[PDB]
Design a protein around this ligand. Structure first.
Ligand SMILES: CC(=O)N[C@H]1[C@@H](O[C@@H]2O[C@H](C[C@@H](O)[C@H]3O[C@@H](n4ccc(=O)[nH]c4=O)[C@H](O)[C@@H]3O)[C@H](O)[C@H](O)[C@H]2NC(=O)/C=C/CCCCCCCCC(C)C)O[C@H](CO)[C@@H](O)[C@@H]1O
Ligand SMILES: CC(=O)N[C@H]1[C@@H](O[C@@H]2O[C@H](C[C@@H](O)[C@H]3O[C@@H](n4ccc(=O)[nH]c4=O)[C@H](O)[C@@H]3O)[C@H](O)[C@H](O)[C@H]2NC(=O)/C=C/CCCCCCCCC(C)C)O[C@H](CO)[C@@H](O)[C@@H]1O
Ligand SMILES: CCCCCCCC/C=C\CCCCCCCC(=O)O[C@H](COC(=O)CCCCCCCCCCCCCCC)COP(=O)(O)OC[C@@H](O)CO
Ligand SMILES: CCCCCCCC/C=C\CCCCCCCC(=O)O[C@H](COC(=O)CCCCCCCCCCCCCCC)COP(=O)(O)OC[C@@H](O)CO
Lengths: 378, 369
């Protein structure tokens, strides 16, 4: 088809634009203090933050320039068009929200609320165009709720699985590429329009995020930040909702779902939650070791002690106990998939750990394809 | 029923703006998004880019209002896509303005990006209306679209350069928005009702959110609106004008801004040297704003333009190491100060708002009487 060919062309041009512009704007970001230190390395220099915006920006540009080509010599159908524009409005609002969130570092209340507001246009489009709120049970209003929350989830599910160089953009590239392959396979199948739409929004995302990862990859010269996390989350939520494969998509979100649940006791502050739960480097080794959350044992609530004991029993959390004059203490293992891989394999270098998590992501995607198409497993 | 709900949510949004602007002050100051009131003695920092909150609220409101018009209304996808496309243009303008303020992009970006962000407006205009003919009966064709594109840019920047005194940006934007609201209501009973009810949908919430912003921005300014609000407002106006089919009437409402943009044009083009700031210098003793000047070496076209201006009495010119010329900084503000001498900041803002209202009354008189 011509629309997809044109789309791929503008997407590669956008990849070049991203790789080019990211260094071109470095002075601006440094000047306005939109930067952060590399916590996992000994160096203390600043690195430009929220580079996702640039990719995001390019992304938007591309799609704005690509809208007409599907409708070439095509009573104009305003519904396909409104799907496009509504999805783009959702993504614009999510990019803007992530950029504002990186400049201001809003509290979690805002981080959860605002992606839902920004996902409303998605629900408008879904209701005017498709509207099928059935899974044989009719989910009704709940279904819309789901879609809303989906957006939030994605934006934040990628957001909390972060901290090592190239993980956010990397795992987002794996997810986007897997969704692209799924779209292509289904492209010959029953639902062609939904999946060609998913492609329209994925391909440029993949290539712009690739331009971003070029700089973000270890050693990280740039950081993607909440801008990229939110942007990616909403793009995925869009193609999943308006593509009608949100189940398959969430299956692709297996590492992120597992890490979000495994972190859930800390995110709810049942077990104390540090401000950063990244694996903290060992200066002698040069590799990343696990990171811990320490606290007075007595203060901990009953539910917290129960969850911690069950986790220790399952061999998921490392627990240490030490005696101090002021009070009794019990160290806990920071509960994030990264610290869990480090519990399983001990010290790992940053680049190798990122590669390992990308590998595990690919395994998750392969599992999803096997489920979808009755393939052989392992 | 739809307009009544629009007004309700717009007042709720006014409350939301007035409440949130101080709620987020900590965030803006902590992230160094602030600036010093150059025209006041104090040196403290004032939070910048507060138009991002109002703007944000604005978007929220409209996102929530979208359904009320289509209540049990072959769904009308064209009306719906116009609402969405306008919202998309406005989102990209709020976002681009906020990013511009944080990063302080060069003029190249400032001009290019509102055109890109205005493309969805042109797409909606082509799919829905597409009329590229004006009676003057000439089918402008592609140029028409160009116009619309540039219109966006112009507005976003036309309000942008007319700035620097407490409450001028949001104030003049409120006058323009209110004038367009009145015009929409007058034409509401006339031939074109849908266009003007659309313009109202977008204008009422903008008016009330911008009002919440001006509450804090008014002399003495406790906040600043910044490129965020300038871009946001400019694009909301360009939208309602384009998709409402009254961009000529609108631009007539942009009378002070057009005059100030053209009067500044020889400096903006660097024919006459242009300082980074061209606001009026406060007089320490007087407590009132006098004119400001650009000083540069006298030793081709620029000199002729300055002589012409001197003859016209629009620019005041005074002529060590070499001959230097202290030309009067060419902005409607410095021109009002050249006509009336020193004026206090609040009084000068009020005066420019009154002149804006005079321009709007002129526009109404031309159109109607
Ligand atoms: C809580 C949490 O884990 N936050 C993360 C999250 O916190 C955000 O951090 C960000 C900064 C972080 O990226 C820094 O790490 C450094 N860095 C970055 C890359 C890199 O390669 N190397 C490096 O050193 C670098 O300095 C960088 O500035 C930012 O401050 C967010 O505001 C902050 N809060 C949240 O995400 C909220 C997150 C709220 C999560 C709530 C989830 C809600 C989902 C609900 C869905 C439900 C309805 C289904 O990210 C951090 C890692 O990037 C984690 O350490 C931190 O723990
Ligand atoms: C050149 C110029 O005049 N710049 C302005 C413009 O410059 C922008 O400044 C901005 C900040 C400014 O708002 C400051 O004013 C201060 N302020 C404001 C009120 C107040 O009460 N107190 C206070 O202190 C406060 O500190 C604040 O930081 C910003 O940095 C832009 O990058 C900067 N450039 C442009 O707009 C470019 C604008 C590009 C103009 C070209 C557009 C061409 C349009 C073409 C359209 C055509 C197709 C029809 O705005 C300034 C604000 O007054 C002016 O003084 C300044 O002179
Ligand atoms: C369509 C949406 C697009 C959004 C674009 C995102 C841009 C982000 C920048 C500014 C957001 C301004 C509006 C935020 C509205 C947030 C609304 C909110 O937080 O409600 C709180 C009450 O519960 C009050 O709050 P508070 O301060 O008491 O909590 C501490
Ligand atoms: C849809 C619109 C969304 C806008 C989103 C707003 C986000 C704002 C942040 C970054 C903008 C990135 C995209 C802008 C694309 C604009 C493309 C562009 O500027 O290319 C020009 C080349 O001709 C100049 O190039 P340059 O490298 O020389 O100048 C860099 C500077 O460091 C020079 O001082």
């Amino acid at each position: 088809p011509m629309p997809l060919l044109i789309n791929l062309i503008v997407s590669l041009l956008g990849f070049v634009a991203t790789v080019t512009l990211i260094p071109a704007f470095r002075g601006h970001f440094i000047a306005a203090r939109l930067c952060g230190q590399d916590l996992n390395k000994t160096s203390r220099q600043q690195i430009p933050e929220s580079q996702g915006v640039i990719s995001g920006a390019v992304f938007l540009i591309i799609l704005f320039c690509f809208i007409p080509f599907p409708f070439l010599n095509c009573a104009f159908p305003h519904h396909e068009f409104v799907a496009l524009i509504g999805a783009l409005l959702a993504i614009c609002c999510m990019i803007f929200l992530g950029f504002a969130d990186d400049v201001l570092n809003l509290r979690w209340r805002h981080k959860l609320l605002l992606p839902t507001a920004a996902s409303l246009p998605l629900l408008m489009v879904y209701f005017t165009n498709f509207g099928n709120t059935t899974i044989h049970l009719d989910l009704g209003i709940l279904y819309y709720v789901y879609m809303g929350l989906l957006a939030v989830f994605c934006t934040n599910a990628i957001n909390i699985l972060a901290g090592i160089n190239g993980l956010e953009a990397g795992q987002s590239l794996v997810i986007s590429a897997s969704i692209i392959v799924f779209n292509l396979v289904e492209l010959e199948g029953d639902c062609r329009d939904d999946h060609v739409f998913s492609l329209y929004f994925m391909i440029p995302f993949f290539f712009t995020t690739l331009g971003l990862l070029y700089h973000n990859w270890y050693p990280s010269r740039v950081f993607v930040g909440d801008t990229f996390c939110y942007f990616a989350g909403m793009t995925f939520a869009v193609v999943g909702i308006l593509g009608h494969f949100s189940k398959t998509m969430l299956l692709f979100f297996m590492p992120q779902v597992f890490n979000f649940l495994y972190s859930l006791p800390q995110l709810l502050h049942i077990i104390p939650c540090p401000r950063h739960r990244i694996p903290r480097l060992n200066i002698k080794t040069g590799k990343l070791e696990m990171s811990y959350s320490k606290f007075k044992t007595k203060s901990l609530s009953f539910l917290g002690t129960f969850i911690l004991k069950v986790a220790e029993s399952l061999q998921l959390v490392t627990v240490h106990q030490s005696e101090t004059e002021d009070g009794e203490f019990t160290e806990c293992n920071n509960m994030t998939l990264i610290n869990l891989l480090l519990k399983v394999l001990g010290p790992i270098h940053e680049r190798n750990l990122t590669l390992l998590l990308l590998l595990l992501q690919i395994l998750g995607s392969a599992i999803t394809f096997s489920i979808r198409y009755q393939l052989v497993r392992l």
